[PDB]
Structure formats: structure tokens, C-alpha cells
Tab-separated table of C-alpha atoms in Angstrom:
chain	number	residue	atom	x	y	z
A	1	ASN	CA	30.866	2.687	-0.187
A	2	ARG	CA	34.128	0.784	0.428
A	3	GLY	CA	32.404	-1.268	3.134
A	4	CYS	CA	30.556	-3.147	0.388
A	5	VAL	CA	33.151	-5.742	-0.540
A	6	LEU	CA	33.688	-8.963	-2.457
A	7	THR	CA	34.681	-12.095	-0.550
A	8	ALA	CA	35.794	-15.420	-2.078
A	9	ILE	CA	35.185	-18.882	-0.680
A	10	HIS	CA	36.466	-22.116	-2.171
A	11	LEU	CA	33.601	-24.552	-2.475
A	12	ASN	CA	32.717	-27.812	-4.204
A	13	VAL	CA	29.783	-27.536	-6.627
A	14	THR	CA	28.033	-29.914	-4.222
A	15	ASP	CA	28.167	-27.166	-1.541
A	16	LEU	CA	25.912	-24.941	-3.673
A	17	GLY	CA	22.902	-27.036	-2.605
A	18	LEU	CA	21.657	-27.334	-6.197
A	19	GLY	CA	21.223	-31.090	-6.040
A	20	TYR	CA	24.034	-32.063	-8.419
A	21	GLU	CA	26.519	-34.852	-7.796
A	22	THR	CA	29.902	-33.835	-9.183
A	23	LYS	CA	33.581	-33.401	-8.304
A	24	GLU	CA	33.804	-29.923	-9.839
A	25	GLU	CA	34.964	-27.115	-7.522
A	26	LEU	CA	34.826	-23.369	-7.882
A	27	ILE	CA	35.653	-20.168	-6.137
A	28	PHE	CA	32.298	-18.631	-5.145
A	29	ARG	CA	32.391	-14.863	-4.636
A	30	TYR	CA	29.753	-12.856	-2.813
A	31	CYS	CA	29.029	-9.271	-1.830
A	32	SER	CA	28.641	-7.997	1.721
A	33	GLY	CA	29.122	-4.739	3.587
A	34	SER	CA	27.379	-1.468	4.317
A	35	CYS	CA	25.842	0.927	1.813
A	36	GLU	CA	25.295	3.813	4.205
A	37	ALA	CA	26.350	6.495	1.691
A	38	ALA	CA	23.885	7.780	-0.921
A	39	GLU	CA	25.129	7.053	-4.462
A	40	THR	CA	22.168	8.503	-6.372
A	41	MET	CA	19.789	11.451	-6.089
A	42	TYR	CA	17.134	8.872	-5.255
A	43	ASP	CA	18.928	7.659	-2.132
A	44	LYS	CA	19.702	11.184	-1.001
A	45	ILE	CA	16.043	12.085	-1.110
A	46	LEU	CA	15.037	8.839	0.603
A	47	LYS	CA	17.300	9.763	3.521
A	48	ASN	CA	16.090	13.353	3.722
A	49	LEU	CA	12.468	12.234	3.693
A	50	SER	CA	13.266	10.224	6.841
A	51	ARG	CA	14.890	13.098	8.724
A	52	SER	CA	11.790	14.926	7.461
A	53	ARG	CA	9.080	12.486	8.515
A	54	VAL	CA	12.439	1.837	3.666
A	55	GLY	CA	13.941	0.953	0.292
A	56	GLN	CA	17.605	1.420	1.344
A	57	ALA	CA	20.412	0.478	-1.076
A	58	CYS	CA	22.205	-2.853	-0.689
A	59	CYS	CA	25.628	-4.331	-1.358
A	60	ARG	CA	25.056	-6.683	-4.323
A	61	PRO	CA	26.757	-8.118	-7.422
A	62	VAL	CA	26.928	-5.599	-10.295
A	63	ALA	CA	28.905	-8.036	-12.445
A	64	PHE	CA	28.965	-11.833	-12.454
A	65	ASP	CA	31.703	-14.369	-13.131
A	66	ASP	CA	31.830	-16.259	-16.424
A	67	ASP	CA	29.589	-19.256	-17.002
A	68	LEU	CA	30.742	-22.420	-15.295
A	69	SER	CA	30.131	-25.689	-17.140
A	70	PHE	CA	30.427	-28.953	-15.264
A	71	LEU	CA	29.805	-32.662	-15.752
A	72	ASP	CA	27.384	-34.398	-13.405
A	73	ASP	CA	27.943	-37.989	-12.261
A	74	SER	CA	24.783	-38.803	-14.231
A	75	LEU	CA	26.538	-37.812	-17.452
A	76	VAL	CA	24.505	-34.609	-17.829
A	77	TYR	CA	26.444	-31.358	-18.279
A	78	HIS	CA	25.236	-28.165	-16.586
A	79	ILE	CA	26.039	-24.482	-16.958
A	80	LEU	CA	25.799	-22.132	-13.973
A	81	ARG	CA	25.144	-18.543	-15.036
A	82	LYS	CA	25.171	-15.495	-12.760
A	83	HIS	CA	26.064	-17.799	-9.884
A	84	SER	CA	29.047	-15.871	-8.553
A	85	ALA	CA	29.929	-12.200	-8.166
A	86	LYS	CA	32.727	-10.652	-10.232
A	87	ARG	CA	32.254	-7.089	-8.935
A	88	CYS	CA	30.222	-5.651	-6.079
A	89	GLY	CA	28.438	-2.343	-5.634
A	90	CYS	CA	25.703	-0.529	-3.703
A	91	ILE	CA	22.479	-0.660	-5.723
B	1	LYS	CA	8.028	-13.431	-7.972
B	2	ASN	CA	8.216	-10.961	-5.089
B	3	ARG	CA	4.856	-9.188	-5.320
B	4	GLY	CA	5.510	-7.375	-2.057
B	5	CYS	CA	8.166	-5.190	-3.740
B	6	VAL	CA	5.969	-2.257	-4.740
B	7	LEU	CA	6.138	1.266	-6.099
B	8	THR	CA	4.763	3.974	-3.817
B	9	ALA	CA	4.041	7.548	-4.926
B	10	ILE	CA	4.056	10.779	-2.931
B	11	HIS	CA	3.353	14.239	-4.318
B	12	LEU	CA	6.062	16.575	-3.034
B	13	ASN	CA	7.445	20.043	-3.609
B	14	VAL	CA	10.972	19.919	-4.933
B	15	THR	CA	11.751	21.991	-1.834
B	16	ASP	CA	10.483	19.015	0.255
B	17	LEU	CA	13.452	16.947	-1.006
B	18	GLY	CA	15.999	18.759	1.133
B	19	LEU	CA	18.284	19.192	-1.879
B	20	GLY	CA	18.630	22.918	-1.327
B	21	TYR	CA	16.491	24.018	-4.257
B	22	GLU	CA	14.550	27.281	-4.019
B	23	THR	CA	11.696	26.629	-6.481
B	24	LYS	CA	7.919	26.109	-6.763
B	25	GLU	CA	8.546	22.951	-8.794
B	26	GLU	CA	6.513	19.930	-7.638
B	27	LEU	CA	6.803	16.281	-8.479
B	28	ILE	CA	5.394	12.867	-7.848
B	29	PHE	CA	8.312	11.132	-6.116
B	30	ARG	CA	8.131	7.338	-6.288
B	31	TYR	CA	10.064	4.860	-4.211
B	32	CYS	CA	10.365	1.076	-3.968
B	33	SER	CA	9.852	-0.948	-0.814
B	34	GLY	CA	8.713	-4.386	0.274
B	35	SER	CA	10.012	-7.946	0.737
B	36	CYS	CA	12.410	-9.834	-1.546
B	37	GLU	CA	12.378	-13.131	0.323
B	38	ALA	CA	12.140	-15.184	-2.882
B	39	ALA	CA	15.400	-15.959	-4.708
B	40	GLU	CA	15.244	-14.719	-8.292
B	41	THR	CA	18.771	-15.545	-9.348
B	42	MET	CA	21.144	-18.484	-9.160
B	43	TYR	CA	23.280	-16.290	-6.913
B	44	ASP	CA	20.520	-15.729	-4.357
B	45	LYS	CA	19.535	-19.397	-4.339
B	46	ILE	CA	23.133	-20.227	-3.503
B	47	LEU	CA	23.233	-17.660	-0.686
B	48	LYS	CA	20.083	-19.155	0.839
B	49	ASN	CA	21.681	-22.592	0.631
B	50	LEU	CA	25.034	-21.520	2.134
B	51	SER	CA	23.236	-19.827	4.989
B	52	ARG	CA	21.245	-22.966	5.762
B	53	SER	CA	24.461	-25.031	5.646
B	54	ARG	CA	26.280	-22.555	7.883
B	55	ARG	CA	29.079	-22.000	5.361
B	56	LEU	CA	28.052	-18.368	4.984
B	57	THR	CA	25.581	-16.908	7.537
B	58	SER	CA	22.686	-14.874	6.068
B	59	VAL	CA	26.072	-11.431	2.886
B	60	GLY	CA	23.825	-8.886	1.213
B	61	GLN	CA	20.388	-10.311	0.407
B	62	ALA	CA	18.354	-8.968	-2.525
B	63	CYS	CA	16.535	-5.690	-1.884
B	64	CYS	CA	13.470	-3.964	-3.325
B	65	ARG	CA	14.902	-1.081	-5.394
B	66	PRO	CA	14.245	0.837	-8.600
B	67	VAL	CA	15.077	-1.204	-11.695
B	68	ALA	CA	14.068	1.782	-13.804
B	69	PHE	CA	14.020	5.515	-13.031
B	70	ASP	CA	11.638	8.274	-14.067
B	71	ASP	CA	12.965	10.562	-16.779
B	72	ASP	CA	15.381	13.354	-15.844
B	73	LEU	CA	13.525	16.379	-14.415
B	74	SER	CA	14.846	19.736	-15.717
B	75	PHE	CA	13.719	23.012	-14.185
B	76	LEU	CA	14.777	26.561	-13.514
B	77	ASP	CA	14.815	27.564	-9.855
B	78	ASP	CA	13.590	30.860	-8.417
B	79	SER	CA	16.809	32.536	-9.588
B	80	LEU	CA	16.427	31.087	-13.089
B	81	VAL	CA	19.350	28.718	-12.442
B	82	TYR	CA	19.041	25.514	-14.472
B	83	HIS	CA	19.011	22.205	-12.579
B	84	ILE	CA	18.422	18.592	-13.593
B	85	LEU	CA	17.471	15.720	-11.293
B	86	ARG	CA	18.681	12.386	-12.704
B	87	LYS	CA	17.776	8.914	-11.340
B	88	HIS	CA	15.817	10.722	-8.614
B	89	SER	CA	12.540	8.830	-8.738
B	90	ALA	CA	11.562	5.213	-9.336
B	91	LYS	CA	9.665	4.188	-12.460
B	92	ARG	CA	9.779	0.394	-11.879
B	93	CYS	CA	10.647	-1.648	-8.770
B	94	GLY	CA	12.454	-4.978	-8.571
B	95	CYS	CA	14.341	-7.289	-6.249
B	96	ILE	CA	18.017	-6.812	-7.076
C	1	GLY	CA	-0.517	-7.126	-15.312
C	2	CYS	CA	-2.397	-6.995	-11.996
C	3	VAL	CA	-0.189	-5.303	-9.410
C	4	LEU	CA	-0.337	-3.504	-6.068
C	5	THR	CA	0.771	0.110	-6.092
C	6	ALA	CA	0.558	2.670	-3.311
C	7	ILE	CA	0.041	6.374	-2.818
C	8	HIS	CA	0.516	8.717	0.153
C	9	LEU	CA	-2.697	10.591	0.887
C	10	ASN	CA	-4.295	12.765	3.569
C	11	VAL	CA	-7.308	11.211	5.285
C	12	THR	CA	-9.177	14.259	4.008
C	13	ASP	CA	-8.260	13.235	0.436
C	14	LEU	CA	-10.497	10.165	0.758
C	15	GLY	CA	-13.647	12.265	0.555
C	16	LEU	CA	-15.339	10.610	3.523
C	17	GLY	CA	-16.075	13.857	5.386
C	18	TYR	CA	-13.454	13.535	8.105
C	19	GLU	CA	-11.854	16.624	9.563
C	20	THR	CA	-8.284	15.594	10.359
C	21	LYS	CA	-4.641	16.224	9.465
C	22	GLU	CA	-3.727	12.529	9.625
C	23	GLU	CA	-2.294	10.819	6.572
C	24	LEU	CA	-2.047	7.274	5.306
C	25	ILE	CA	-0.600	5.179	2.551
C	26	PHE	CA	-3.424	3.870	0.407
C	27	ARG	CA	-2.624	0.762	-1.575
C	28	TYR	CA	-4.729	-0.376	-4.504
C	29	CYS	CA	-4.927	-2.956	-7.275
C	30	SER	CA	-4.608	-2.141	-10.950
C	31	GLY	CA	-3.622	-3.711	-14.217
C	32	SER	CA	-4.983	-6.083	-16.815
C	33	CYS	CA	-6.196	-9.652	-16.418
C	34	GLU	CA	-5.459	-11.241	-19.784
C	35	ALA	CA	-5.117	-14.816	-18.528
C	36	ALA	CA	-8.339	-16.833	-18.528
C	37	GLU	CA	-8.296	-19.157	-15.518
C	38	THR	CA	-11.642	-20.833	-16.210
C	39	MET	CA	-13.413	-21.936	-19.359
C	40	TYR	CA	-16.019	-19.232	-18.605
C	41	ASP	CA	-13.279	-16.554	-18.935
C	42	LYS	CA	-11.851	-18.212	-22.065
C	43	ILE	CA	-15.333	-18.161	-23.641
C	44	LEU	CA	-15.929	-14.487	-22.738
C	45	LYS	CA	-12.612	-13.551	-24.298
C	46	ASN	CA	-13.444	-15.536	-27.455
C	47	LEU	CA	-17.028	-14.196	-27.715
C	48	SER	CA	-15.630	-10.710	-27.213
C	49	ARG	CA	-12.918	-11.133	-29.838
C	50	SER	CA	-15.365	-12.538	-32.410
C	51	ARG	CA	-17.846	-9.746	-31.611
C	52	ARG	CA	-20.612	-12.246	-30.817
C	53	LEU	CA	-20.978	-10.272	-27.577
C	54	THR	CA	-20.699	-6.501	-27.972
C	55	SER	CA	-20.251	-4.942	-24.520
C	56	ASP	CA	-16.690	-3.590	-24.224
C	57	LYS	CA	-15.236	-6.374	-22.069
C	58	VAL	CA	-18.464	-7.971	-20.779
C	59	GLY	CA	-17.846	-9.583	-17.405
C	60	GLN	CA	-14.096	-10.254	-17.767
C	61	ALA	CA	-11.843	-10.811	-14.735
C	62	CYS	CA	-10.901	-7.745	-12.682
C	63	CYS	CA	-7.698	-6.783	-10.815
C	64	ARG	CA	-8.968	-6.505	-7.243
C	65	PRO	CA	-7.795	-6.695	-3.639
C	66	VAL	CA	-7.790	-10.264	-2.340
C	67	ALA	CA	-6.496	-9.258	1.108
C	68	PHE	CA	-6.585	-5.956	3.025
C	69	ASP	CA	-4.035	-3.944	5.029
C	70	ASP	CA	-4.492	-3.429	8.739
C	71	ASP	CA	-7.460	-1.211	9.569
C	72	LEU	CA	-6.651	2.510	9.726
C	73	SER	CA	-7.396	4.401	12.958
C	74	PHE	CA	-7.159	8.111	13.604
C	75	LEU	CA	-8.457	10.893	15.840
C	76	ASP	CA	-10.373	13.665	14.107
C	77	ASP	CA	-10.320	17.353	15.050
C	78	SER	CA	-13.268	16.937	17.410
C	79	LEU	CA	-11.106	14.340	19.163
C	80	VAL	CA	-13.344	11.459	18.039
C	81	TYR	CA	-11.720	8.133	17.154
C	82	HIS	CA	-12.515	6.493	13.803
C	83	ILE	CA	-11.433	3.141	12.422
C	84	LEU	CA	-11.520	2.608	8.609
C	85	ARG	CA	-11.870	-1.108	7.969
C	86	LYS	CA	-10.842	-2.932	4.780
C	87	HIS	CA	-9.781	0.398	3.324
C	88	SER	CA	-6.541	-0.562	1.612
C	89	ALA	CA	-5.218	-3.567	-0.335
C	90	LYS	CA	-2.487	-5.875	0.918
C	91	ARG	CA	-2.579	-8.346	-2.014
C	92	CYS	CA	-4.058	-8.113	-5.556
C	93	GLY	CA	-5.483	-10.751	-7.851
C	94	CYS	CA	-7.522	-11.186	-11.027
C	95	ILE	CA	-10.985	-12.304	-9.924
D	1	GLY	CA	-27.314	-3.820	-12.146
D	2	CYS	CA	-25.172	-6.971	-11.944
D	3	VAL	CA	-27.378	-9.737	-13.371
D	4	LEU	CA	-27.246	-13.123	-15.065
D	5	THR	CA	-28.203	-13.402	-18.750
D	6	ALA	CA	-28.928	-16.754	-20.472
D	7	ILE	CA	-28.412	-17.115	-24.231
D	8	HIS	CA	-28.611	-19.965	-26.725
D	9	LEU	CA	-25.352	-20.590	-28.610
D	10	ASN	CA	-23.777	-23.176	-30.898
D	11	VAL	CA	-20.775	-24.870	-29.330
D	12	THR	CA	-18.947	-23.606	-32.433
D	13	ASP	CA	-19.701	-19.972	-31.422
D	14	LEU	CA	-17.355	-20.602	-28.444
D	15	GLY	CA	-14.249	-20.588	-30.616
D	16	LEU	CA	-12.727	-23.699	-29.117
D	17	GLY	CA	-12.024	-25.126	-32.580
D	18	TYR	CA	-14.291	-28.159	-32.323
D	19	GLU	CA	-16.482	-28.891	-35.326
D	20	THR	CA	-19.908	-29.893	-34.092
D	21	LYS	CA	-23.620	-29.163	-34.344
D	22	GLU	CA	-24.152	-29.247	-30.560
D	23	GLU	CA	-25.529	-26.180	-28.759
D	24	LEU	CA	-25.615	-24.957	-25.214
D	25	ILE	CA	-27.210	-22.382	-22.954
D	26	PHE	CA	-24.402	-20.034	-21.902
D	27	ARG	CA	-25.135	-17.770	-18.944
D	28	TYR	CA	-22.913	-14.794	-18.177
D	29	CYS	CA	-22.667	-12.103	-15.524
D	30	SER	CA	-22.718	-8.455	-16.606
D	31	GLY	CA	-23.962	-5.101	-15.345
D	32	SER	CA	-22.817	-2.174	-13.242
D	33	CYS	CA	-21.360	-2.446	-9.757
D	34	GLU	CA	-21.359	1.224	-8.774
D	35	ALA	CA	-22.288	0.360	-5.175
D	36	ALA	CA	-19.354	0.834	-2.780
D	37	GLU	CA	-19.723	-2.096	-0.392
D	38	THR	CA	-16.312	-1.641	1.202
D	39	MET	CA	-14.390	1.404	2.358
D	40	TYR	CA	-11.849	0.487	-0.370
D	41	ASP	CA	-14.409	0.869	-3.158
D	42	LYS	CA	-15.841	4.028	-1.560
D	43	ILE	CA	-12.348	5.474	-1.578
D	44	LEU	CA	-11.597	4.416	-5.159
D	45	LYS	CA	-14.779	6.120	-6.368
D	46	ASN	CA	-13.909	9.324	-4.500
D	47	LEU	CA	-10.339	9.340	-5.852
D	48	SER	CA	-11.620	8.847	-9.406
D	49	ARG	CA	-14.180	11.652	-9.109
D	50	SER	CA	-11.611	13.963	-7.508
D	51	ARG	CA	-9.307	12.922	-10.353
D	52	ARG	CA	-6.804	11.833	-7.706
D	53	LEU	CA	-6.241	8.493	-9.470
D	54	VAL	CA	-8.119	2.109	-10.152
D	55	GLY	CA	-10.229	-0.988	-10.743
D	56	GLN	CA	-13.616	-0.947	-9.052
D	57	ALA	CA	-15.881	-3.930	-8.397
D	58	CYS	CA	-16.951	-6.024	-11.371
D	59	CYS	CA	-19.895	-8.253	-12.033
D	60	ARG	CA	-18.658	-11.835	-11.962
D	61	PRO	CA	-19.735	-15.425	-11.486
D	62	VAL	CA	-19.732	-16.512	-7.846
D	63	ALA	CA	-21.140	-19.920	-8.764
D	64	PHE	CA	-21.134	-21.986	-11.963
D	65	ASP	CA	-23.502	-24.216	-13.907
D	66	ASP	CA	-23.040	-27.989	-14.077
D	67	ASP	CA	-20.603	-29.511	-16.581
D	68	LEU	CA	-21.735	-29.732	-20.192
D	69	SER	CA	-20.665	-32.713	-22.270
D	70	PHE	CA	-20.802	-32.525	-26.047
D	71	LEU	CA	-20.026	-34.698	-29.052
D	72	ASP	CA	-17.647	-33.717	-31.800
D	73	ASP	CA	-17.677	-34.844	-35.415
D	74	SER	CA	-15.313	-37.540	-34.147
D	75	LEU	CA	-14.881	-40.380	-31.655
D	76	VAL	CA	-13.997	-37.979	-28.839
D	77	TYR	CA	-16.350	-36.716	-26.133
D	78	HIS	CA	-15.632	-33.271	-24.690
D	79	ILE	CA	-16.639	-31.698	-21.402
D	80	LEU	CA	-16.965	-28.049	-20.424
D	81	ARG	CA	-16.513	-27.306	-16.712
D	82	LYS	CA	-17.045	-23.905	-15.029
D	83	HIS	CA	-17.950	-22.556	-18.471
D	84	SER	CA	-21.278	-20.898	-17.561
D	85	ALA	CA	-22.401	-18.741	-14.615
D	86	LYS	CA	-25.117	-19.809	-12.164
D	87	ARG	CA	-24.945	-16.821	-9.785
D	88	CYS	CA	-23.441	-13.359	-10.066
D	89	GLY	CA	-21.936	-10.946	-7.590
D	90	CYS	CA	-20.052	-7.650	-7.573
D	91	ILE	CA	-16.513	-8.479	-6.459
């Protein structure tokens, strides 16, 4: 499913909408694209049961980037975990 | 918590699966379906926020899928040929 | 835990005496209710655990439908319409 | 089947940890609810008998008794709210 791909966008942590005030920036990566091909027995049978008579697979992160630690303007440090995709896949 | 993501069971003949098997084997096939509107990860919260801000239009959203699969099903078909179905039926559903 | 699960069935499978080939997806509520939301439930759980009350799980909370799916309609073999109301769960809760 | 039962208990029988000599009348709902009021319960019963399948109606409080205040072996007053049934119903 090569249509399911990873895209990177350069953002400020403040663009994440998490309510933090900081100058930290990051490259945010996300998954998008089609998952029209069956990658498991389960999806094959889901299809067949349609052509016979939802739950379709989706392009999502299967691996996440490393933790990102940043300093707030309020002196509090924060760690974002599983906030950005490292690898994408149909699941 | 996306309570709408549920497991649904259907009793089928393995021949109902359209996999080409010639057997009398039957099984309870289970599949996952339902809504996953609620963000369950930092990643999904961010996607919701970037869509609202128009920096990334609503990307693959989380979907209701199996998080666990029933055990492998081994059987001999009508010609005594051995076959195994792996990750063919849902055991547990989750927004992923 | 209390969750909604579903099963594909034939209307005939319901045992209501209908003669039809129509099917449906029946959804139901099942699971335990171990959280006591009121003092009454906390007391029943304590009385039960201390054996001051004997009945298995005397009056404890049950996993039940708190909302129902749309009503099911179908035509039987005699070409008579039937509507099954509040026949399937849409949401489950410990009550 | 589903009825209210009133019994005389010591507050200490409740297992709330409070040391006291106070008592109370505790009323609870119990009994069978094998009457299928809704199509849903009719169906559950049929699926259980046909071994096709799961929780049928249960006898529960649909109304509660007034609050009960009680004194501890200390300077603190305690109050029990919705701790005793006043009316029962199969739900």
C-alpha cells in the first residue's frame, strides 16, 4: 500500500494546539494515503463478505518519533510522546 | 474511550470466506466497526488541532480495527490438504 | 467491563414465531459492573464480601442497554409487515 | 419476585471502617426478574434457552430512602446518602 505515506511539516510547538507557550519547534510527521489493498487474511475476508452481501484498514503511524522534551515559558518542562509518526503503514 | 468501536460476530462456513477453500469447516468470524471520533493519542489530538487550524485538513484518522486476533485456525480441507488461517478474525477491537 | 457486542442472526433465530428469511444484527450488553456508583452499591458489595448477606450477588448493578437501536422492520412470508421495537442495544451501562 | 426487604443492621456491619454503636434500617432490592418486558429481554431469554448466547433484567432500586446521619466515636458526624432502597424495579 504505497499510497499510505509519511509527510513532514515544520511547525512550532505552539502550532500543536496543546496550550503551551514555548519557542521550541519540531518537524511533525503524519500518515495519509489509501489502504485499498488487503494486508491480512482479515481484510481479505472483509472485502469478500461485501461482494458477498465497515472496519476497513487505515493509513496510520506504526512507529513514532523519539520523545521531545521542551521548556515552557512558565519554567515547566514537558515531554511529548507518540506525538509524531516515524513510520507509516496500513493497519 | 470510543465505546462505539465494537466487536461483531457472524457464524460462517469457511467456504463463505471466498478464500477458495473446499471444506466443511465453520467458524465464528468477528470483525470490528464503529466510530473513533475521540482522540486517544497525542498524535490524534494534534491532528484534530491542525485540522481546526487549517494547517492540515482532516490525514488518516484513527479507525476501529482489531487490536488482537483470534488464534490461528488449522484445518484439513476436503482433500486432506493442511491450511492455517492467521490473523483472520478479531478477538479485541480498538481505535488505532 | 460492561460493553456492547453484536451478533448476526436470522429473525427466525429470535424465537418469536416469525416465518421469514430476513436477518439482523442484534447488539447486546454484557460484562461486569465492579464499580459502586452509590453508597447502596458499596454496601451491597461489602455485605456480600463479608457474607452478612448470602445470595450470590444480591441486587448488584447490571450491565444493561441504556439506549436502543432503530426499530427493526421486516416482511414475513405471508407478506405481513412487523416492527420489532426496542429489540437491540445501542449503548450499555451498569444500572 | 423483585421485592424490597428491610433489615436491622449496625453501622459497623456496613464495612465503612467507622467505629460506632449506631444502627440503621437497610432496605435492599432482590428477587427474580424473569418477565420479558421488552423485545430485547424476550430475545435474550430465547437466545439463552436456544444456547445461542447476556445480562437480563435485574432487581434494583428505582428510588432511595432519605439520608441517614450517624455519630462516630469521634467529633465527626457522617451522612449516608442513597444508601438504602425505597422502591424496586426490574431494569
